[PDB]
Protein backbone atom coordinates (compact mmCIF):
# COMPACT_ATOMS: atom_id res chain seq x y z
CA UNK A 219 0.00 0.00 0.00
CA UNK A 220 3.02 2.33 0.69
CA UNK A 221 4.27 1.81 -2.95
CA UNK A 222 0.63 1.85 -4.34
CA UNK A 223 0.16 5.37 -2.80
CA UNK A 224 3.41 6.62 -4.48
CA UNK A 225 2.49 4.87 -7.83
CA UNK A 226 -0.90 6.77 -7.77
CA UNK A 227 0.92 10.09 -7.00
CA UNK A 228 3.24 9.87 -10.11
CA UNK A 229 0.84 7.97 -12.49
CA UNK A 230 -0.70 9.60 -15.61
CA UNK A 231 0.56 10.61 -19.11
CA UNK A 232 4.10 12.10 -18.86
CA UNK A 233 3.04 14.28 -21.91
CA UNK A 234 0.37 15.86 -19.59
CA UNK A 235 2.99 16.25 -16.75
CA UNK A 236 5.32 18.10 -19.26
CA UNK A 237 2.69 20.89 -19.74
CA UNK A 238 2.59 21.37 -15.90
CA UNK A 239 6.22 20.98 -14.66
CA UNK A 240 8.31 21.37 -17.89
CA UNK A 241 9.70 19.19 -20.73
CA UNK A 242 12.53 17.79 -18.46
CA UNK A 243 9.86 16.64 -15.91
CA UNK A 244 12.17 17.76 -13.02
CA UNK A 245 10.07 17.83 -9.78
CA UNK A 246 12.13 19.46 -6.96
CA UNK A 247 11.87 23.24 -7.66
CA UNK A 248 14.58 25.51 -9.13
CA UNK A 249 16.85 28.58 -8.74
CA UNK A 250 16.22 31.94 -10.52
CA UNK A 251 19.60 33.60 -9.70
CA UNK A 252 21.95 31.87 -12.27
CA UNK A 253 23.65 34.58 -14.43
CA UNK A 254 23.45 32.11 -17.43
CA UNK A 255 19.57 32.00 -17.16
CA UNK A 256 17.99 34.48 -19.63
CA UNK A 257 14.53 35.69 -18.39
CA UNK A 258 11.85 34.44 -18.60
CA UNK A 259 13.35 31.47 -16.68
CA UNK A 260 11.47 28.19 -17.46
CA UNK A 261 10.84 25.41 -14.87
CA UNK A 262 13.34 23.28 -16.91
CA UNK A 263 16.04 26.03 -16.69
CA UNK A 264 15.40 26.75 -12.95
CA UNK A 265 15.44 22.97 -12.15
CA UNK A 266 18.71 22.10 -13.99
CA UNK A 267 20.57 25.26 -12.74
CA UNK A 268 19.51 24.23 -9.15
CA UNK A 269 21.02 20.74 -9.73
CA UNK A 270 24.20 22.32 -11.25
CA UNK A 271 24.51 24.57 -8.12
CA UNK A 272 24.22 21.42 -5.90
CA UNK A 273 27.02 19.69 -7.92
CA UNK A 274 29.14 22.93 -7.65
CA UNK A 275 28.61 22.96 -3.82
CA UNK A 276 29.52 19.20 -3.70
CA UNK A 277 32.95 20.03 -5.32
CA UNK A 278 32.28 18.64 -8.88
CA UNK A 279 33.51 21.85 -10.69
CA UNK A 280 37.00 21.10 -9.17
CA UNK A 281 39.03 18.89 -11.60
CA UNK A 282 41.45 17.66 -8.81
CA UNK A 283 38.93 15.05 -7.48
CA UNK A 284 38.49 11.29 -8.16
CA UNK A 285 36.86 9.98 -11.41
CA UNK A 286 33.07 9.38 -11.10
CA UNK A 287 32.79 5.68 -12.14
CA UNK A 288 29.38 4.85 -10.53
CA UNK A 289 26.29 7.05 -9.87
CA UNK A 290 23.02 6.28 -8.00
CA UNK A 291 19.80 8.36 -8.38
CA UNK A 292 17.44 7.35 -5.48
CA UNK A 293 13.82 8.09 -6.59
CA UNK A 294 14.84 9.00 -10.15
CA UNK A 295 11.47 10.56 -11.25
CA UNK A 296 11.08 10.77 -15.09
CA UNK A 297 14.87 10.26 -15.56
CA UNK A 298 16.25 13.73 -16.58
CA UNK A 299 18.86 13.89 -13.72
CA UNK A 300 20.33 10.52 -14.95
CA UNK A 301 20.27 11.81 -18.59
CA UNK A 302 22.04 15.08 -17.51
CA UNK A 303 24.63 13.15 -15.41
CA UNK A 304 25.40 10.74 -18.35
CA UNK A 305 26.23 13.84 -20.52
CA UNK A 306 28.15 15.66 -17.68
CA UNK A 307 30.14 12.44 -16.83
CA UNK A 308 30.60 10.95 -20.35
CA UNK A 309 33.28 8.46 -19.06
CA UNK A 310 30.87 7.15 -16.34
CA UNK A 311 29.71 3.74 -17.71
CA UNK A 312 27.29 2.90 -14.81
CA UNK A 313 24.47 5.22 -13.64
CA UNK A 314 21.80 3.41 -11.56
CA UNK A 315 18.26 4.75 -10.99
CA UNK A 316 15.82 3.28 -8.43
CA UNK A 317 12.09 4.14 -8.31
CA UNK A 318 8.86 2.54 -6.91
CA UNK A 319 6.77 4.17 -9.76
CA UNK A 320 6.55 1.67 -12.69
CA UNK A 321 5.05 4.38 -15.00
CA UNK A 322 8.04 6.75 -14.33
CA UNK A 323 10.53 3.82 -14.87
CA UNK A 324 8.77 2.86 -18.18
CA UNK A 325 9.13 6.55 -19.30
CA UNK A 326 12.81 6.66 -18.09
CA UNK A 327 13.60 3.48 -20.13
CA UNK A 328 12.08 4.94 -23.36
CA UNK A 329 13.61 8.46 -22.81
CA UNK A 330 17.15 7.08 -22.10
CA UNK A 331 16.93 4.59 -25.05
CA UNK A 332 15.90 7.49 -27.41
CA UNK A 333 19.13 9.32 -26.27
CA UNK A 334 21.39 6.20 -26.72
CA UNK A 335 21.87 5.78 -22.90
CA UNK A 336 20.09 2.37 -22.35
CA UNK A 337 23.51 0.63 -21.78
CA UNK A 338 25.00 3.32 -19.43
CA UNK A 339 21.82 3.91 -17.28
CA UNK A 340 20.33 0.94 -15.32
CA UNK A 341 16.74 1.33 -13.99
CA UNK A 342 15.41 -0.81 -11.07
CA UNK A 343 11.99 -1.05 -9.39
CA UNK A 344 13.58 -0.82 -5.93
CA UNK A 345 12.51 0.85 -2.65
CA UNK A 346 15.33 3.03 -1.16
CA UNK A 347 15.24 0.78 1.98
CA UNK A 348 16.14 -2.32 -0.21
CA UNK A 349 19.28 -0.80 -1.86
CA UNK A 350 21.36 -3.80 -0.47
CA UNK A 351 19.79 -5.66 -3.51
CA UNK A 352 21.50 -3.34 -6.11
CA UNK A 353 24.07 -5.44 -8.02
CA UNK A 354 27.91 -5.32 -8.05
CA UNK A 355 28.82 -4.79 -4.35
CA UNK A 356 32.49 -4.56 -5.61
CA UNK A 357 31.68 -1.12 -7.22
CA UNK A 358 30.85 1.56 -4.59
CA UNK A 359 28.98 4.80 -5.54
CA UNK A 360 31.05 7.99 -6.15
CA UNK A 361 27.94 10.21 -6.43
CA UNK A 362 24.43 9.60 -4.98
CA UNK A 363 21.47 11.91 -5.81
CA UNK A 364 18.42 12.09 -3.47
CA UNK A 365 16.42 14.97 -5.07
CA UNK A 366 12.99 15.68 -3.47
CA UNK A 367 12.45 12.04 -2.31
CA UNK A 368 12.96 11.69 1.53
CA UNK A 369 9.75 13.80 2.12
CA UNK A 370 7.94 10.53 1.03
CA UNK A 371 9.86 8.48 3.70
CA UNK A 372 8.54 7.70 7.19
CA UNK A 373 11.41 8.39 9.69
CA UNK A 374 12.15 4.62 10.11
CA UNK A 375 12.48 4.19 6.28
CA UNK A 376 14.80 7.29 6.11
CA UNK A 377 17.08 5.88 8.88
CA UNK A 378 17.16 2.30 7.39
CA UNK A 379 17.76 3.76 3.84
CA UNK A 380 20.76 5.90 4.97
CA UNK A 381 22.17 2.89 7.00
CA UNK A 382 21.83 0.73 3.82
CA UNK A 383 23.35 3.50 1.58
CA UNK A 384 26.39 4.39 3.75
CA UNK A 385 28.27 1.05 3.22
CA UNK A 386 27.80 1.28 -0.61
CA UNK A 387 29.33 4.84 -0.84
CA UNK A 388 33.06 4.99 -1.73
CA UNK A 389 35.07 6.76 1.02
CA UNK A 390 35.33 10.34 -0.36
CA UNK A 391 32.01 9.82 -2.23
CA UNK A 392 29.30 12.52 -2.22
CA UNK A 393 25.55 12.21 -1.42
CA UNK A 394 23.68 15.24 -2.92
CA UNK A 395 20.26 15.66 -1.22
CA UNK A 396 17.38 18.16 -1.71
CA UNK A 397 14.36 17.91 0.65
CA UNK A 398 11.43 20.06 1.89
CA UNK A 399 11.89 20.43 5.71
CA UNK A 400 9.85 22.22 8.46
CA UNK A 401 11.43 25.21 10.28
CA UNK A 402 8.63 25.03 12.99
CA UNK A 403 8.39 22.23 15.66
CA UNK A 404 4.60 22.73 16.46
CA UNK A 405 1.14 21.78 15.04
CA UNK A 406 -0.43 25.03 13.68
CA UNK A 407 -4.27 25.32 13.13
CA UNK A 408 11.48 16.23 9.60
CA UNK A 409 13.37 19.35 10.87
CA UNK A 410 16.88 20.40 9.69
CA UNK A 411 18.29 19.18 13.08
CA UNK A 412 16.71 15.65 12.83
CA UNK A 413 17.43 15.43 9.04
CA UNK A 414 21.17 16.21 9.54
CA UNK A 415 21.45 13.99 12.70
CA UNK A 416 20.30 10.82 10.79
CA UNK A 417 23.15 11.38 8.23
CA UNK A 418 25.90 12.15 10.84
CA UNK A 419 24.68 9.29 13.15
CA UNK A 420 25.03 6.95 10.09
CA UNK A 421 28.72 8.09 9.81
CA UNK A 422 28.41 10.65 6.94
CA UNK A 423 30.34 13.94 7.42
CA UNK A 424 28.24 17.11 6.73
CA UNK A 425 29.90 18.91 3.72
CA UNK A 426 27.31 21.69 2.98
CA UNK A 427 23.77 22.34 4.33
CA UNK A 428 21.82 25.51 3.34
CA UNK A 429 18.35 26.75 2.28
CA UNK A 430 18.43 26.29 -1.54
CA UNK A 431 16.48 27.20 -3.50
CA UNK A 432 15.47 30.38 -1.56
CA UNK A 433 11.86 30.39 -0.16
CA UNK A 434 10.93 32.98 -2.89
CA UNK A 435 12.47 30.76 -5.68
CA UNK A 436 10.49 27.67 -4.47
CA UNK A 437 7.32 29.87 -4.38
CA UNK A 438 8.11 31.13 -7.95
CA UNK A 439 8.51 27.50 -9.22
CA UNK A 440 5.19 26.48 -7.56
CA UNK A 441 3.21 29.56 -8.79
CA UNK A 442 4.68 29.10 -12.36
CA UNK A 443 3.65 25.37 -12.36
CA UNK A 444 0.18 26.52 -11.09
CA UNK A 445 -0.08 29.02 -14.01
CA UNK A 446 1.03 26.20 -16.43
CA UNK A 447 -1.72 23.79 -15.15
CA UNK A 448 -4.41 26.58 -15.31
CA UNK A 449 -3.30 27.53 -18.90
CA UNK A 450 -2.87 23.96 -20.32
CA UNK A 451 -5.81 22.34 -18.37
CA UNK A 452 -8.43 25.15 -18.34
CA UNK A 453 -11.28 22.55 -17.92
CA UNK A 454 -9.65 21.06 -14.78
CA UNK A 455 -6.51 19.02 -13.98
CA UNK A 456 -7.02 15.85 -11.83
CA UNK A 457 -5.08 13.63 -9.38
CA UNK A 458 -1.58 14.94 -8.52
CA UNK A 459 -1.68 17.89 -11.04
CA UNK A 460 -4.93 19.28 -9.46
CA UNK A 461 -3.38 18.73 -5.95
CA UNK A 462 -0.17 20.54 -7.17
CA UNK A 463 -2.34 23.45 -8.47
CA UNK A 464 -3.96 23.70 -4.93
CA UNK A 465 -0.77 22.90 -2.84
CA UNK A 466 1.12 25.65 -4.87
CA UNK A 467 -0.77 28.54 -3.08
CA UNK A 468 -0.70 26.97 0.44
CA UNK A 469 3.00 25.86 0.12
CA UNK A 470 4.01 29.28 -1.39
CA UNK A 471 2.28 31.02 1.62
CA UNK A 472 4.18 28.67 4.04
CA UNK A 473 7.46 29.53 2.18
CA UNK A 474 6.92 33.37 2.31
CA UNK A 475 6.15 32.95 6.09
CA UNK A 476 9.38 30.80 6.40
CA UNK A 477 7.30 27.93 7.98
CA UNK A 478 9.07 25.55 5.50
CA UNK A 479 12.24 25.69 3.32
CA UNK A 480 13.89 23.46 0.67
CA UNK A 481 17.45 22.52 1.84
CA UNK A 482 20.53 21.46 -0.18
CA UNK A 483 22.13 18.76 2.04
CA UNK A 484 25.55 17.46 0.80
CA UNK A 485 27.35 14.82 2.91
CA UNK A 486 30.52 12.78 2.25
CA UNK A 487 31.64 9.36 3.46
CA UNK A 488 34.94 10.16 5.25
CA UNK A 489 38.24 8.87 3.81
CA UNK A 490 39.12 6.89 7.00
Ligand SMILES: Nc1ncnc2c1ncn2[C@@H]1O[C@H](CSCC[C@H](N)C(=O)O)[C@@H](O)[C@H]1O
Nearest residue numbers: 244245246293295317318319345346365370
Ligand atom coordinates in the same frame (compact mmCIF):
# COMPACT_ATOMS: atom_id res chain seq x y z
N1 LIG B 1 10.68 4.61 -1.01
C1 LIG B 1 11.01 5.04 -2.22
N2 LIG B 1 11.97 4.37 -2.91
C2 LIG B 1 12.30 4.81 -4.13
N3 LIG B 1 11.82 5.85 -4.81
C3 LIG B 1 10.87 6.49 -4.10
C4 LIG B 1 10.43 6.16 -2.84
N4 LIG B 1 9.45 7.05 -2.42
C5 LIG B 1 9.33 7.89 -3.42
N5 LIG B 1 10.16 7.60 -4.47
C6 LIG B 1 10.28 8.35 -5.72
O1 LIG B 1 10.85 9.60 -5.44
C7 LIG B 1 10.44 10.55 -6.45
C8 LIG B 1 9.93 11.81 -5.79
S1 LIG B 1 9.70 13.17 -6.96
C9 LIG B 1 11.40 13.61 -7.41
C10 LIG B 1 11.87 12.95 -8.70
C11 LIG B 1 13.30 13.32 -9.11
N6 LIG B 1 14.28 13.00 -8.04
C12 LIG B 1 13.37 14.81 -9.47
O2 LIG B 1 14.17 15.52 -8.83
O3 LIG B 1 12.64 15.20 -10.38
C13 LIG B 1 9.41 9.82 -7.32
O4 LIG B 1 10.02 9.34 -8.51
C14 LIG B 1 8.96 8.67 -6.41
O5 LIG B 1 8.44 7.57 -7.13
